[PDB]
Design an enzyme around this catalytic site. Structure first.
Site, short mmCIF file in Angstrom:
data_model
loop_
_atom_site.label_atom_id
_atom_site.label_comp_id
_atom_site.label_asym_id
_atom_site.label_seq_id
_atom_site.Cartn_x
_atom_site.Cartn_y
_atom_site.Cartn_z
N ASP A 1 48.43 33.64 45.82
CA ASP A 1 49.10 34.71 45.08
C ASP A 1 48.47 36.04 45.42
OD1 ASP A 1 50.96 35.45 42.67
OD2 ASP A 1 49.06 36.49 42.27
N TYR B 1 46.97 45.15 45.66
CA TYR B 1 45.59 44.63 45.53
C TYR B 1 44.71 45.11 46.68
CZ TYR B 1 47.47 41.18 42.21
OH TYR B 1 48.09 40.50 41.17
N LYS C 1 54.42 40.76 45.39
CA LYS C 1 54.92 41.43 44.19
C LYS C 1 55.38 42.86 44.45
CE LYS C 1 51.54 38.88 41.35
NZ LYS C 1 50.39 38.93 42.29
N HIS D 1 56.73 42.87 39.63
CA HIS D 1 55.37 42.79 39.08
C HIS D 1 55.33 43.08 37.57
CE1 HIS D 1 50.84 43.29 40.21
NE2 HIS D 1 50.98 42.76 39.01
N1 LIG Z 1 51.30 39.27 37.48
C1 LIG Z 1 50.29 40.03 36.99
O1 LIG Z 1 50.52 41.01 36.29
C2 LIG Z 1 48.90 39.56 37.16
C3 LIG Z 1 47.87 40.09 36.37
C4 LIG Z 1 46.58 39.60 36.55
C5 LIG Z 1 46.37 38.61 37.51
N2 LIG Z 1 47.37 38.14 38.25
C6 LIG Z 1 47.09 37.11 39.27
O2 LIG Z 1 46.41 35.96 38.71
C7 LIG Z 1 45.16 35.78 39.42
C8 LIG Z 1 44.09 35.16 38.51
O3 LIG Z 1 44.00 35.88 37.27
P1 LIG Z 1 42.63 36.73 37.20
O4 LIG Z 1 42.06 37.12 38.58
O5 LIG Z 1 42.91 38.00 36.39
O6 LIG Z 1 41.48 36.02 36.30
P2 LIG Z 1 41.18 34.44 36.35
O7 LIG Z 1 41.77 33.68 37.62
O8 LIG Z 1 41.66 33.75 35.13
O9 LIG Z 1 39.57 34.35 36.33
C9 LIG Z 1 38.97 35.17 37.32
C10 LIG Z 1 37.47 35.23 37.01
O10 LIG Z 1 36.95 33.91 36.75
C11 LIG Z 1 35.83 33.67 37.65
N3 LIG Z 1 35.90 32.26 38.00
C12 LIG Z 1 36.80 31.64 38.83
N4 LIG Z 1 36.63 30.35 38.79
C13 LIG Z 1 35.61 30.07 37.92
C14 LIG Z 1 34.97 28.89 37.47
N5 LIG Z 1 35.37 27.66 37.93
N6 LIG Z 1 33.99 29.00 36.57
C15 LIG Z 1 33.61 30.18 36.12
N7 LIG Z 1 34.16 31.32 36.51
C16 LIG Z 1 35.15 31.29 37.40
C17 LIG Z 1 36.02 34.60 38.87
O11 LIG Z 1 34.76 35.01 39.42
P3 LIG Z 1 34.50 34.56 40.95
O12 LIG Z 1 35.51 35.11 41.90
O13 LIG Z 1 33.06 35.19 41.33
O14 LIG Z 1 34.47 32.95 41.00
C18 LIG Z 1 36.67 35.82 38.17
O15 LIG Z 1 35.65 36.68 37.65
C19 LIG Z 1 44.80 37.20 39.86
O16 LIG Z 1 43.80 37.20 40.88
C20 LIG Z 1 46.17 37.67 40.38
O17 LIG Z 1 46.49 37.01 41.62
C21 LIG Z 1 48.60 38.57 38.10
C1 LIG Z 2 45.55 45.62 34.68
C2 LIG Z 2 45.97 46.03 36.11
C3 LIG Z 2 47.50 45.90 36.17
C4 LIG Z 2 48.09 46.14 37.55
C5 LIG Z 2 47.44 45.28 38.59
O1 LIG Z 2 48.08 44.70 39.45
C6 LIG Z 2 45.95 45.16 38.55
C7 LIG Z 2 45.35 45.04 37.14
C8 LIG Z 2 43.83 45.18 37.23
C9 LIG Z 2 43.42 46.61 37.54
C10 LIG Z 2 43.97 47.59 36.51
C11 LIG Z 2 45.51 47.49 36.42
C12 LIG Z 2 46.12 48.52 35.45
C13 LIG Z 2 45.63 49.95 35.75
C14 LIG Z 2 44.11 50.02 35.77
C15 LIG Z 2 43.53 49.78 34.36
C16 LIG Z 2 43.53 51.33 36.33
O2 LIG Z 2 43.57 52.40 35.39
C17 LIG Z 2 42.09 50.93 36.73
C18 LIG Z 2 42.11 49.41 36.99
C19 LIG Z 2 43.59 49.03 36.82
CL LIG Z 3 54.53 47.15 46.11
#
Ligand SMILES: NC(=O)c1ccc[n+]([C@@H]2O[C@H](COP(=O)([O-])OP(=O)(O)OC[C@H]3O[C@@H](n4cnc5c(N)ncnc54)[C@H](OP(=O)(O)O)[C@@H]3O)[C@@H](O)[C@H]2O)c1
Ligand SMILES: C[C@]12CCC(=O)C[C@H]1CC[C@@H]1[C@@H]2CC[C@]2(C)[C@@H](O)CC[C@@H]12
Ligand SMILES: [Cl-]
Length: 325
Positions: A52, A57, A86, A119
């Protein structure tokens, strides 16, 4: 049934999606160059077949580098890999949708993406800034027209640039706008939203299942808890007493329990890790199952509090989180 070697689940357009993928958002500032590419390669070596990502990003070129390297050496074929990209808020103007997808294809250096999703339902002022704010701090909200944006997406699928179309951060009524569109060609096959035991999305999941839409759980491990944008009011999900107790039972970590929870109920999870050990750990979720009693208990952890509130945008007309769901 799901296994390390075979864990793709059906989408409503006849395609399929691996039920676990690697998330790739990382803070641009505090992330070494190459970290994303390396992690994507490790993930594919490990068995992940879903990545993803998003142009905004700032590492989509690294994701592409990794995927193409693995294809070139014969680790996977292109059709074995599932990439989701996205469309950002600044790019909602119908005329901009195709050029925006084409940019992503050129960045990845691939012919198509497997899934392309809106997105957020909010439109921002088009321009070289992904987060448009005036001199005085005010966010610059362009008027949203979701059906028109969707029509432009549909045309991308018709052109063969993308296999499946979806949305993200859409609430029930925003999903309705599209589902009820006059002359709709391609329905959304997926809605990517925050989902995990502290915010289990009970109503939205039932709504999506009724319309044959798969939920993708973003922040399935409760986020990195970065204060700048995460709501740290809730205790860290991974430190949860119950999730940790169940971990002991299965000799698995809390993270493995939370991932297994969501995939066991047909929710796609996209945990992000750029850490070698954790990338592997997150994938080891096919060699155990949770009991119904345990599932029920994990469900009960629901706090209806979002780690991801995006409050700074709560004034935009299409802000998704005012509604109950
Ligand atoms: N559609 C949207 O609006 C949206 C918003 C947010 C995210 N996303 C997508 O969803 C993905 C995942 O969500 P997220 O990145 O926000 O947070 P997350 O996947 O829930 O958790 C990320 C955090 O957990 C840590 N981590 C990963 N595996 C672990 C484990 N087994 N044990 C302990 N810690 C662990 C990672 O650190 P390390 O890397 O050091 O392991 C990182 O700090 C994003 O990267 C993005 O692709 C989409
Ligand atoms: C939540 C999120 C939403 C939009 C996105 O794809 C990334 C994600 C994490 C970084 C965030 C962002 C919203 C806008 C900010 C809060 C900026 O003001 C600084 C970091 C940004
Ligand atoms: Cl875009």
């Amino acid at each position: 049934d799901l296994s390390a070697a075979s864990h793709r689940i059906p989408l409503s357009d006849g395609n399929s999606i691996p039920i676990i993928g690697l998330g790739t958002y990382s803070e641009p500032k505090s992330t070494p160059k190459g970290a994303c590419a390396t992690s994507v390669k490790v993930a594919i070596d490990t068995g992940y077949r879903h990545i993803d990502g998003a142009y905004i990003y700032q590492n989509e070129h690294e994701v592409g580098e990794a995927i193409r390297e693995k294809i070139a050496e014969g680790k996977v074929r292109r059709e074995d890999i599932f990439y989701c990209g996205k469309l950002w808020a600044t790019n909602h103007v119908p005329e901009m949708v195709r050029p925006t997808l084409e940019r992503t294809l050129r960045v990845l250096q691939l012919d198509y993406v497997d899934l392309y999703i809106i997105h957020v339902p909010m439109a921002f002022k088009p321009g070289d800034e992904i987060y448009p704010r005036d001199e005085n701090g005010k966010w610059l909200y362009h008027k949203s027209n979701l059906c028109a944006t969707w029509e432009a997406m549909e045309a991308c699928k018709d052109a063969g640039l993308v296999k499946s179309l979806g949305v993200s951060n859409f609430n029930r009524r925003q999903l309705e706008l599209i589902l009820n569109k006059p002359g709709l060609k391609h329905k959304p096959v997926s809605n990517q939203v925050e989902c995990h035991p502290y915010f289990t999305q009970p109503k939205l999941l039932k709504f999506c299942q009724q319309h044959d839409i798969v939920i993708t759980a973003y922040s399935p491990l409760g986020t990195s808890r970065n204060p700048i944008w995460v709501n740290v009011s809730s205790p860290p999900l991974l430190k949860d007493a119950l999730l940790n107790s169940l971990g002991k039972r299965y000799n698995k970590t809390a993270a493995q329990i939370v991932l297994r929870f969501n995939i066991q109920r047909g929710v796609v999870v996209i945990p992000k890790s750029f850490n070698l050990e954790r990338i592997k750990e997150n994938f080891q979720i096919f060699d155990f199952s949770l009991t119904e009693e345990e599932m029920k208990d994990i469900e009960a952890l629901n706090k209806n509090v979002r780690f991801v509130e995006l409050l700074m945008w709560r004034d935009h007309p299409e802000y998704p989180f005012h509604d109950e769901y």
